[PDB]
């Protein structure tokens, strides 16, 4: 208003915006409801190794005690611990969960995993394998119907044994390989050849028993080589479709949208006009261009690597503008692991 004479001043209305990167690793673990040597509190929050020792002063032998001791020993960070009846509540609240691992629970865990997928929370679990010693005489399929088929998760069979103490479920071994990966070099690279320390596998599998379990589903054995030892081996998800294999290409799309959806919550109820459309289009591709130089998604002439479009008649025509909708679409081509390396000799 301009009621009285004098010196008035106004400032800018709106400023720029951009997305903040990630967290990439916050797991919740699988407590057991019938367990005794533990607290009756369902949800615990642990931040580092310090308070875990003052809460649990004695070294135990249970599967959860051997799992968190393997998480923190390879780095690790803020990790939760919930009972196996309250996953569907704990994910919908804490707003930062990435991994649902199974610390030796199978039956009631697979139902609570596919529950929070059904609402579309964009999460990535990972499961256990069978207990001991597939004989390898026959039956390649009947050990694989007890696992929920979905593009979220792997199984990690061979059951490392932790020669210091008792056995370790392999979800903890797989979760430790992701921690020293995203801290070292990105999330688009597979938790594939980074070695773990202090864990030996109980079995020696083969070179060819990997072969018959590489199609259909994704056993993803844990095999020890000469030189580098006790390393993980194979990064494959449960389906075999040419869009959704290769666990790192799933986690790339899984973490490239949880930072855009987190940022655009302060841009709703904004006027659906022309200066909005040229500002979101100029803010998204400035995040992808920072992601293309880092080697996350492959392609020259970076108009070929991705595309962003938003407008008035290419998308969201006039009648659905009157309903308030503001629809966009972006598409990008990620990288894939070089799982097979073949090389040809000739004479020329």
């Amino acid at each position: 208003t301009t009621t009285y004479p004098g010196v008035y001043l106004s400032e800018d209305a709106v400023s720029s915006f951009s997305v903040n990167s990630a967290a990439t690793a916050v797991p919740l673990f699988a407590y057991d409801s019938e367990n005794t040597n533990t607290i009756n509190k369902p949800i615990q929050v642990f931040r580092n190794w310090a308070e875990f020792t003052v809460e649990y002063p004695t070294p135990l032998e249970d599967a959860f005690y051997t799992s968190l001791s393997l998480w923190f020993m390879h780095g690790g960070g803020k990790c939760y611990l919930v009972n196996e009846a309250n996953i569907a509540d704990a994910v919908a609240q804490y707003d930062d969960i990435t991994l649902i691992v199974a610390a030796g629970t199978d039956t009631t865990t697979y139902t609570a995993f596919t529950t929070v997928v059904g609402q579309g929370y964009r999460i990535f679990g990972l499961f256990d394998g069978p207990k001991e010693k597939i004989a390898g005489t026959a039956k390649p399929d009947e050990v694989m119907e007890e696992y929920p088929t979905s593009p979220f998760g792997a199984v990690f069979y061979p059951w490392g044994t932790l020669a210091s103490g008792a056995a370790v479920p392999p979800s903890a071994i797989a979760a430790a390989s992701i921690t020293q990966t995203d801290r070292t070099r990105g999330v688009w690279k597979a938790p594939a050849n980074q070695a773990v320390n202090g864990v030996t596998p109980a079995f020696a599998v083969s070179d060819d028993f990997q072969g018959k379990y590489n199609q259909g589903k994704a056993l993803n054995m844990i095999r020890t080589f000469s030189g580098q030892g006790t390393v993980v081996w194979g990064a494959r998800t449960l389906e075999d479709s040419d869009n959704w294999r290769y666990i790192p290409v799933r986690r790339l799309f899984n973490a490239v949208e949880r930072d855009i959806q987190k940022s655009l919550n302060k841009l709703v109820f904004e006027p659906n006009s022309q200066p909005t459309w040229q500002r979101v289009k100029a803010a998204v591709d400035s995040y992808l261009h920072s992601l293309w130089q880092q080697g996350a998604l492959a392609g020259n002439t970076p108009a070929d690597a991705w595309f962003v479009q938003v407008g008035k008649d290419l998308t969201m025509t006039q009648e659905e503008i009157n309903q308030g909708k503001m629809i966009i679409k972006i598409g990008l081509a990620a990288v894939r692991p070089a799982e097979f390396i073949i090389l040809q000799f000739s004479q020329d």
């Binding site: 004479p5 004098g6 010196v7 001043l9 400032e11 800018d12 709106v14 400023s15 720029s16 915006f17 951009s18 931040r47 580092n48 803020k78 302060k266």
Partner: protein, 185 residues
């Protein structure tokens, strides 16, 4: 028994040293609190990660240098103003030009008044640019003050006597999260 004290009193005095030698545009963090025993509750780095978003600041304790203030973030967290000095730089640049335009508030709206105001604002941001407070490069691009009639105005708001001063700066941001990223070559 030692008595506690809410730190909003003695933190006002540490804004009086930073504007002395360094000026307004430097965030007071590395300044050392002058005369205290210890904090009431000892904070550690693992819950510093939680409190540094939802931006609130923190008094820290170090072993070698004692107590120190830490963090210079304001409350609301859009990229417009998340930093104390970028907020306080625009707050002080307005108050000095608004106090001196008050003697000329009823003068005629002709053209020779426009070039005399646009110059006295131009010679204020240029002096402030060449002492390291506007984050522009060796070009001129730190100010675009314009007061004309074809630009920034038109004829019909002259009749309901107005002037429009479109001015804009490019402030400097504090440097936190220094990242090294060594390589082999």
């Amino acid at each position: 028994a030692p008595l506690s004290l809410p730190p909003s009193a003695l933190i006002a005095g540490v804004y009086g040293k930073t504007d002395g030698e360094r000026g307004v545009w430097k965030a007071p963090a590395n300044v050392v609190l002058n005369g205290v025993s210890d904090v009431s509750v000892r904070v550690t780095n693992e819950q510093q990660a939680e409190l540094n978003p939802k931006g609130i600041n923190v008094i820290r304790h170090f072993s070698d240098r004692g107590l120190v203030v830490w963090g210079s973030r304001t409350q609301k967290d859009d990229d417009d103003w998340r930093y104390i000095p970028v907020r306080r730089l625009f707050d002080a640049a307005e108050r000095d030009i608004k106090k001196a335009l008050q003697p000329m508030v009823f003068e005629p709206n002709s053209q020779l008044t426009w070039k005399r105001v646009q110059t006295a604002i131009d010679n204020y941001l240029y002096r402030l640019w060449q002492q390291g407070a506007l984050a522009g490069n060796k070009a001129e691009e730190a100010y675009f003050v314009r007061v004309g009639k074809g630009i920034t105005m038109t004829q019909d708001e002259i009749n309901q006597g107005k002037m429009i001063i479109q001015v804009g700066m490019a402030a400097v941001r504090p440097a936190e999260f220094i990242i090294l990223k060594f390589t082999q070559d």
